[PDB]
Amino acid sequence: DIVMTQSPKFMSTSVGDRVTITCKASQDVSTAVVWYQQKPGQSPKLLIYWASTRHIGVPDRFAGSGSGTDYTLTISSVQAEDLALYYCQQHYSPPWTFGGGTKLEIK
């Protein structure tokens, strides 16, 4: 099984900044990384698949990046509404393994 590893487990930036969030995995998953965002008391939603393709209606300000084992979601212009847990998820082989989430606190 592939193992999506996330660290840190909490992250904070102020309003208007950039933040970057590290998701890595066991072996080369060939960019097939998905990003979700789950805001407190809400379903997750699909941000990004193939580590870079923004899903319908997620804004330009969420950028996808990665390769091999190593992936990073970057948010820019950190709005007040961006506090949530971000989750990565492998989609190269079954079973689809998710990272453990990362809290984004806005400083």
């Binding site: 960019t31 193939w50 870079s52 393709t53 923004r54 899903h55 082989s93 079954p94």
Partner: protein, 389 residues
């Protein structure tokens, strides 16, 4: 036929798609000796049509099928077998050795081109009438590659597109014009596409048209039109927002004609399209993200209008089954007023997605144009990955 072919008809009115041929190769391969193939195509002779594909020198059930996911090995040939029979160890004919091919018949006999070697000392040999006649070394020493489907001839001239260089960069694609096996001429990629990979082609009214892969930065499709007589050509993109490559972004309301519609990076899948105005049909996977399902959609004037949408569909295979490569072919020698347009769909099985088995192979499924509006079925490879365990 003792005289070379001319493309003298145009396409017939494509109003639905009937079934032409489906080998059940993987269902039959849990118990006959079928070879592990990948990259299929189907190409006709004046006297028969036959499926083709790259072999991996091992049967589905034998021990050496473990790892057939590797694209390139010195154990792969271009093999043919009769329509809807399996590529089996005993009915399969070998055409030429190596890991990327393209073959087509010139009216008189057939040409077949095989590419071989290491990634930086790879080499093409153009066979014609089952004898080797020309060889081509790499011009850029990075995995020299050609069509993976039927090439098309007019008056003794068959254009082949090749690409050598990277599927991430700028790569150096180069169109050749063979006649009877020899290099008549060749040309560097002219026109607007960024990168050209792996085309599938067709012919109507003395024009050879090709739909291809922008594996570099495109989710839309570079298309190459070749004049077999002038031995000349352009490239451009399909204007329609209905994107056919895969992985894909969502479909825009307004796609782009002359540059890669962006969203996905360094990834593609081989695919086709019939571009004939009001009578245009675009095939694409149902999945945005992976090779699942196959849909055929009428999108009138897709190549030109940058705001075109489907006016009709047809599901070749459900999103809950698997798809893969797709390319076109036509029975050029087939009595009538026009050309019955056809395509195949590679059904891929095994790894990386169904990883419980250590192999990867596939099935052909194949349809041709019916002018009547026929009802639709959807066409699964059909095997249960659990009986091979």
């Amino acid at each position: 036929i003792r005289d070379f072919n001319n493309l003298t008809k145009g396409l017939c009115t494509i109003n639905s798609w009937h079934i032409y041929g489906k080998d059940n190769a993987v269902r039959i391969g849990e118990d006959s000796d079928v070879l592990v193939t990948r990259e299929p195509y189907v190409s006709c002779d004046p006297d028969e049509c036959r499926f083709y594909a790259l072999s991996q020198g091992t049967t589905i059930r034998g021990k050496h099928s473990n790892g057939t996911i590797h694209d390139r090995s010195q154990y792969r040939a271009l093999i043919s077998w009769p329509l809807s029979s399996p590529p089996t160890v005993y009915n399969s004919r070998v055409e030429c050795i190596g890991w990327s091919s393209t073959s087509c018949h010139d009216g008189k006999t057939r040409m077949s081109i095989c590419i071989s070697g290491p990634n930086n000392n790879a080499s093409a040999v153009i066979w014609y009438n089952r004898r080797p006649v020309t060889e081509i070394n790499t011009w850029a020493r990075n995995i020299l590659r050609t069509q993976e489907s039927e090439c098309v001839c007019h008056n003794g001239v068959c254009p082949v597109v090749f690409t050598d260089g990277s599927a991430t960069g700028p790569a150096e694609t180069r169109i050749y014009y063979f006649k009877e096996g020899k290099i008549l001429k060749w040309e560097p990629l002219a026109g607007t596409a960024k990168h050209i990979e792996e085309c599938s082609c067709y012919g109507e009214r003395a024009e050879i048209t090709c739909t291809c892969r922008d594996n570099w930065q495109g989710s839309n499709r570079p298309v190459i039109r070749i004049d077999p007589v002038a031995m000349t050509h352009t490239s451009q993109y399909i204007c329609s927002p209905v994107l056919t490559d895969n992985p894909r972004p969502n479909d825009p309301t307004v796609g782009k004609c002359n540059d890669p519609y962006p969203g996905n990076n360094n990834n593609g899948v081989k695919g086709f399209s019939y571009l004939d105005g009001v009578n245009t049909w675009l095939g694409r996977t149902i999945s945005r993200a992976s090779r699942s399902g196959y849909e055929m959609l009428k999108v009138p004037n897709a190549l030109t209008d940058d705001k075109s949408k489907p006016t009709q569909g047809q599901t070749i295979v459900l999103n809950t089954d698997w798809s893969g490569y797709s390319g076109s072919f036509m029975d050029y020698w087939a009595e009538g007023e026009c050309y019955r347009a056809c395509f195949y769909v590679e059904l891929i099985r095994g790894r990386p997605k169904e990883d419980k088995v250590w192999w990867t192979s596939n099935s052909i499924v194949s349809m041709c144009s019916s002018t009547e509006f026929l009802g639709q079925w959807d066409w699964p490879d059909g095997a249960k990955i659990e009986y091979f365990l």
